[PDB]
Design a protein around this ligand. Structure first.
Ligand code: GTP
Ligand code: GTP
Ligand code: GDP
Ligand code: GDP
Ligand code: MG
Ligand code: MG
Lengths: 91, 439, 430, 439, 428
């Protein structure tokens, strides 16, 4: 997670992040595990559910992308891959 | 040279236009100042902005849109905010008093005062066009300005402009929730006019987008800002074949032919996939077959209607990003095999595909995740007849005791037009019965 | 000495022609700038077939690229080999056809073909002795088929005794990518029956199946599909440019292939295609190449030859080889497949031998088959057309512009007549 | 390639499933964070995780599992603990109210509201499966959710998925110790739908694990964590033919045919050997010919029934570790010569074998030791004739005075279903009588 | 000149064929890379029998590998000699058969054998003058037996006058690893009586007994068992590839062995097989090799030769030796064993000699017995078959797939007819 899109992985909510007027602002004993836990934290206006763990960077595009290792039909037609035997070092 | 004019009318037409023009500025790399970034190389091969923006000799871009409304309390928020210097001062036209949920005030009394002023901008905007492709009109059926002033603007526009394909992006009233009492009145009086003067008309409602934002984007408490960014992705996906090159390009006139089989049926449904949050995109494997199957699901439909009741006439699929052309055609032939998805028997060839190269763009820190592939589906179904048989039940039940009538006839329309508009809509649902039957 | 004028219409035709010009510029040793970078004199021996000279020894192609939408023109011009074409050979409109045969043939096809025929005439009387015309298009669209068949008609009226060769991408059952596809297919076939000397049918199902099961690629790009098309397209006409033991040009193939004035639709093929990892397990020998030629997996039209009888077969071999390995192999395959060749034409097969192989490869072949199995494709088009036409779907976009409702019935009757001719000649004895 | 989907239903399903997936991740090398670890073998080309983990381009693996339960107290333990990274957020389905040990609540009232959601998850996970072999459903005969919900889970699964194999891993009610009071009612209604919706259903009860853990493991106080560790070793022994290569490969459809003699008799018995304490092994090392005798010992049987009372139908033995095929042949010929072990006269080919190469693995904090070779036995005996003989005597004693019936009939089902399901089991006990006799 | 096309069916057949291809690769001197690295120029004289020449001087085998599960193909392709095969000759399914003859014949085999015949026709038509086909299989499984009989039927009805060899690992009494094994064996022999030129019976009982007694391995691995099978497979067909003083190829043995058209199940046997321990002290002869050949404990089948009369005997020798010491030994062993040979066929023993032995051995043997001792094997199969069939055990899986009840009785009638024919020709 840290390595993928290394620029700052998106980190979960902490005590220093919370500002005045936020819906997650609480009174009493305050830690970070409470804001990380799903059943204590509340949703905010016009924002999704808090992450509860670390996600990759802002410019990371999710999903499985397959990069072809072939050369295509120029390599399929433009040459005939004749086998080339390797000479050995003379023992 | 191909390029479009977007006309935003009504309150909800303006507020969608804030989210649509925010997306087009970020997609083409245009600042809210209206200029390309200064820390830029000379580059070259940049003509994608001609569809939506017009180059000034000093280096500025002016959007090709007219923000028109009959009240000044929603346009003054645009003349003061961040984009206050992107727009022309005359492209933001304000009225003096609002329509107040009346079709009569939006059509006869008040809306006649400014239509000479509104259409003068459109002729000025169209005169700059080397080749014009069509129009796009954003409005809402339940409102006064979105129903009244949109009717006379489209009637006057069809006379002057002969055969330019004009589009509608309408917020149809929801089956269960409603923010007005006179909503069935203004929706019936709109659909009588728009069958004659609209080449195509897309349908969304606010209740179906509420269920999407809860189960997919994981938003417990949505906001109208969050809905207008979902609608703005579809408009940026439909037009994306015009701006950026692709393997299979579909212009605006190309999917007029491929979605309208009869002249009185031009009501498709909009569906965009994938829409997921960042928490779920990190786990899922978003292949081409997964995003194609996500449009046929009944939960992903953006209109509260069940597609299992009716049959699909024709479908239009517009892929984006790095989608190989084979995985499109392998996914479609799986859909045709399944017996739950039903097609009419007079349209065996039901799918049209179009591939673009530029991947979708999102807003940083927003709700949607960053994915390099997507699909937008415009499917024509006979299931929309249930969405109108419900509305006419609300109109018939309300009109039997003659309620809310003296506000309409007190401005100039006659009582006979209420029964004339209803008698046309009874003929429209008979048109769906005569096409749904099998030979 | 014999000149072929090339013609591109529509998006599919434009891309296929661009890839074909890339392929033959690679074969003749022409850089993208336009000069000559070759290693032999045999390349410049016969070069006037496709290229016109300019000042300072720059060769320009003899092709006309026409479309109703300038986006494809910009896409072709900003490509790898896009700087060799004459800018006066790019003819574009301002309004798109919109996948409509009426828009392609009557409304927007009226004002462009004056300029198109002016350009193609100015190229046509610049040759010494014109061999004929080549046009690449797709029958499933509005510009490729619509304006394409009008160009067929006007050129056939202007030049009565020439060779007219068309490479048409016919529609497919399961890769149907348009809803007005049976309409456009029938309306284009009705004109292509009586106005074209040779038509070669290319199918995307067959192209995808070749790219999947034979070559085993992972990302079959449209560039790769156009390369498959261009290989056969440049292998058909190789005896007009390279000397060989047995020569056979376009008129030779036409005379030796089409028996009756309506049966001129062919199924193409290519013969040395194997995957990258199975190259070294196989030897480039004439028996292996002939077996791979007559195999049914290399046909570029999705019609099984096991469902019909072959009328005539032509094959153009390339590469230095013997002649018993050609003649004996074809005699053996004709004697072994007794139940698949017709009995009222003895010696169903024709061979030609060329001495110059494709670059980087020892031997190659191009297969052209005339068969009674293309009636399957025509039947599956006709039943779709009937199913749409009974309920009259999608017809107001055609009839609001000046097309009557008798033309559809006349075209359907003509295509059913063609299918009946195929069935008649398939079921025929002594 | 070859792979299966595992569905965990009820509290007995989820708590067993926690022990299974901590075993599988360590066996394949995947961290609890969900990623392959650092300093891994470059260019390994391993596809052994493909059976139970789905690759994603970000480097993560997601299990092919669904956790289903009706109350949030057992699922929220997984969402909060150290395995919250590995699972998909939507693969963990959570209800609102529990069935309160009613088959009527888990089949008619509570289970009908989330069954539309659970089967939708099964389709999206089977969509990725290019080749699927079967399903793994974890349940118990005691509770209502393991009785009601599992009954119509596999009812709809058999209709939609035609001939795919389905294995039930059920916790049989122990003959003496039990928790519930209406537990004899649930098991009669549980199996009424199992005789004609299950391809196989394996049989392990709670009490026989207690005597094995007390004597073999020398554990004076076994815990429900320790019981699920023995269950996970048997399930990982069955699936070890899919993931790892071996001398003899036994597919999921292989012993599905080879263990079921008639369409009504599909209840095999599991037995593991050796299951020893950590301290004993270092001084002494085992052999193949001695671990075969440990399977047939009634003390080491995992079911509280006496195999000497009945006769064997067929045996399916699975050997894992450093096992040669010759020593298996010598061990079986030793078994058939003995007089205590008896086989029916119409099954001369009484056995079936399976050899694999990868030995069983250990976990940090577990109770078992590192053993070079181990054997898991699946047997089909007539010794379970006494097993349902006493639960039928527990059913009628409850039902003679009609006690605890008014709760079940108040939630939807009628009175005749108890008597209809009763005579089905009076027929099944007679079926062992007509089969076990020698002709 | 005279070619044999090899076909591996099932997991057991695939492993047997892979071991065979390794064995003859070391016999003809081919490295796993693909080229030729040998010493004698006589190895390249007859190499077209099993190998095809490619460009650059590579040789690829004429083998096709078929099954329904891709795991066996992956395991073979990742093996030691797994890079020599063509990459298009692997055809595999995606679902298992589950030892179901009905699945391997009716439901699942109907999709794959089209492609299998498509490959086999290309290999058989690329040759010059095809001799015939080899197919390796076992008579206990649905993947092996059913698909093998269907493939044999298709190839036989396509090529009417050829030679067909099936090397079958026959099920054994006490090494039962499948509960539907008698059902599969009867249903497969029902087709192998009427559709196969030669079938060779291999018994796991005799394999384990030989490996325990005369090789003395502590661990008789399946690799060594397939090595001992591959010795016999390479020894049968050495007259095609190597010159000899007396020649006896496939049809030479086929005409000479089979008296009546329903008796083609042979018991193989190999003679210079010795314990791993003492190479240095001694050298072989012909009487010693004949004694170890005709020893009943060295038979590769679980049928005692002394419980019946030999119909015909074949002996193929390898090495440099005279022929009086062969004919005299055949004569005196037949004179010694008066009762064990039939009365109405004098000179029951046929011999052949090839010059080149297998590598590392001065002299080598090969024994083929056609005797009346296989009637007890078919009797013990039939008793288990009818014991299961009387109560209809394990039958619903087979009969729910579209195959009736009377076909088992037809197979049982065929088996009873065959075991009556054995007694009829034993006592005359
Ligand atoms: N999708 C969507 N719908 C909106 C939004 N804002 C308003 N609406 C819809 O607009 C409908 C009524 O129209 P109004 O928003 O009141 O404005 P109007 O159409 O101009 O009508 P008047 O205010 O009388 O001129 C309501 O029923 C809402 O459903 C929005 O931001 N997004
Ligand atoms: N072997 C074993 N059995 C368990 C375990 N947990 C629960 N059980 C069994 O589960 C039976 C009762 O079912 P529950 O645990 O309540 O789960 P359920 O079947 O879904 O029933 P409800 O929770 O009421 O919905 C008991 O009789 C136990 O024998 C476990 O960890 N190991
Ligand atoms: N083989 C091939 N087919 C193509 C290509 N581009 C488009 N097509 C096919 O052409 C059909 C549509 O033709 P179309 O582009 O609408 O014709 P046009 O409008 O006249 O350019 C589709 O079914 C595509 O499958 C291409 O580059 N190669
Ligand atoms: N010689 C030998 N026999 C084997 C081997 N593996 C399995 N067998 C035998 O094959 C029989 C089962 O055949 P099976 O594997 O089910 O055939 P399949 O259905 O095609 O896979 C068993 O009785 C074994 O004795 C092996 O490696 N070598
Ligand atoms: Mg207002
Ligand atoms: Mg519970």
């Amino acid at each position: 997670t840290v390595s993928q899109v290394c620029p700052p992985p998106r980190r979960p909510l902490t005590v220093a992040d919370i500002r005045s007027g936020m819906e997650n602002e609480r009174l009493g004993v305050v830690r970070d595990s409470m804001f990380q836990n799903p059943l204590i934290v509340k949703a905010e206006l016009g924002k999704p559910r808090e992450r509860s763990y670390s996600l990759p960077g802002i410019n990371f595009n999710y999903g499985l992308y397959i990069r072809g290792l072939d050369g295509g039909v120029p390599e399929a037609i433009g040459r005939w891959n004749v086998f080339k035997q390797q000479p050995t070092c003379p023992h | 040279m191909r390029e479009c004019i977007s006309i935003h009318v009504g309150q909800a037409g303006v507020q969608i236009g804030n989210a649509c023009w925010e997306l087009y500025c970020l997609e083409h790399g245009i600042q809210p100042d209206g200029q390309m970034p200064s820390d830029k190389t000379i580059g070259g091969g940049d003509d994608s902005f001609n569809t939506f923006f017009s180059e000034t000799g000093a280096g500025k871009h002016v959007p090709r849109a007219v923000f028109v409304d009959l009240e000044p309390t929603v346009i003054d928020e645009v003349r003061t905010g961040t984009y206050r210097q992107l727009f022309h001062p005359e492209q933001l036209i304000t009225g003096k008093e609002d329509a107040a949920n009346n079709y009569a005030r939006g059509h006869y009394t008040i809306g006649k005062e400014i239509i000479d002023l509104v259409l003068d901008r459109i002729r000025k905007l169209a005169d700059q066009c080397t080749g014009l492709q069509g129009f796009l009109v954003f409005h809402s059926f339940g409102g006064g300005t979105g129903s009244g002033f949109t009717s006379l603007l489209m009637e006057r526009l069809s006379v002057d402009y002969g055969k330019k394909s004009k589009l509608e992006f309408s917020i149809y009233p929801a089956p269960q929730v409603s923010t007005a009492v006179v909503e069935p009145y203004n929706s019936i009086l709109t659909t009588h006019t728009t069958l004659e003067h609209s080449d195509c008309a897309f349908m969304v409602d606010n209740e179906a987008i509420y269920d999407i934002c809860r189960r997919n984007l994981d938003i417990e408490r949505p906001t109208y800002t969050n809905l207008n960014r979902l609608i703005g992705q579809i408009v940026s996906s439909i037009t994306a074949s015009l701006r950026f090159d692709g393997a299979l390009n579909v212009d605006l006139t190309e999917f007029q032919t491929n979605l309208v089989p009869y002249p009185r049926i031009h009501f498709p449904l909009a569906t965009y996939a994938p829409v997921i949050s960042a928490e779920k995109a990190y786990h899922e494997q978003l292949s081409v077959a997964e995003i194609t199957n996500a449009c046929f699901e009944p939960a992903n439909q953006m209109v509260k209607c069940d597609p299992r009741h009716g049959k699909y006439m024709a479908c239009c699929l517009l892929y984006r990003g790095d989608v190989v052309p084979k995985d499109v055609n392998a996914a479609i032939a799986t859909i045709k095999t399944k017996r739950t998805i039903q097609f009419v028997d007079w349209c065996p060839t039901g799918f049209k595909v179009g591939i673009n190269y530029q991947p979708p763009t999102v807003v940083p820190g927003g709700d949607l995740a960053k994915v390099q592939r997507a699909v937008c589906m415009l499917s024509n179904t006979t299931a929309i007849a249930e969405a109108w048989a419900r509305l006419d039940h609300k109109f018939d039940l309300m009109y039997a005791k003659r309620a809310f009538v003296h506000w309409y006839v007190g401005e100039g329309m006659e009582e006979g037009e209420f029964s004339e508009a209803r008698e046309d809509m009874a003929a429209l649902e008979k048109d769906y019965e005569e096409v749904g039957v099998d030979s | 000495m014999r000149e072929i004028v090339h013609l591109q219409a529509g998006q599919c035709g434009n891309q296929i022609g661009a890839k074909f010009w890339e392929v033959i510029s690679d074969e003749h040793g022409i850089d993208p700038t336009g000069t000559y970078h070759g290693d032999s004199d045999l390349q410049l021996e016969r070069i006037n077939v496709y290229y016109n000279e300019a000042t300072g020894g720059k060769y320009v192609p003899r092709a006309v690229l026409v479309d109703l939408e300038p986006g494809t023109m910009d896409s072709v011009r900003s490509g790898p080999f896009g700087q060799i074409f004459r800018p006066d050979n790019f003819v574009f409109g301002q309004s798109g056809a919109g996948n409509n045969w009426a828009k392609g043939h009557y409304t927007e096809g009226a004002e462009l073909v004056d300029s198109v025929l002016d350009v193609v005439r100015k190229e046509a009387e610049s040759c010494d002795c014109l061999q004929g015309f080549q046009l690449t298009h797709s029958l499933g669209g509005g510009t490729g088929s619509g304006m394409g068949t009008l160009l067929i008609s006007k050129i056939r009226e202007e030049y009565p005794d020439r060779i007219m060769n068309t490479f048409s991408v016919v529609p497919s059952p399961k890769v149907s990518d348009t809803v007005v596809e049976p309409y456009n297919a029938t309306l284009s076939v009705h004109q292509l029956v009586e106005n074209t000397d040779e038509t070669y049918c290319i199918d995307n199902e067959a192209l995808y199946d070749i790219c999947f099961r034979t070559l085993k690629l992972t990302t079959p790009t449209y560039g790769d599909l156009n390369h498959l098309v261009s290989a056969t397209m440049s292998g058909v006409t190789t005896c007009l440019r390279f000397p060989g033991q047995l020569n056979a040009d376009l008129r030779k193939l036409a005379v030796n292939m089409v028996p009756f004035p309506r049966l001129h639709f062919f199924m193409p093929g290519f013969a040395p295609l194997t995957s990258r990892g199975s190259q070294q397990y196989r030897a480039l020998t004439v028996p292996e190449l002939t077996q791979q030629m007559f195999d049914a997996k290399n046909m570029m039209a999705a019609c099984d030859p096991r469902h019909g009888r072959y009328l005539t077969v032509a094959a153009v071999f390339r590469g230095r080889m013997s002649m018993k390995e050609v003649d004996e192999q074809m005699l053996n395959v004709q004697n072994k497949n007794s139940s698949y060749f017709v009995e009222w034409i003895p010696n169903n097969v024709k061979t030609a031998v060329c001495d110059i192989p494709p670059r980087g490869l020892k031997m190659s072949a191009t297969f052209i088959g005339n068969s009674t199995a293309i009636q399957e494709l025509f039947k599956r088009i006709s039943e779709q057309f009937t199913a749409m036409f009974r309920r009259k779907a999608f017809l107001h976009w055609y009839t609001g512009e000046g097309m009557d409702e008798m033309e559809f019935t006349e075209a359907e009757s003509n295509m059913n007549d063609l299918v009946s001719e195929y069935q008649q000649y398939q079921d025929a004895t002594a």
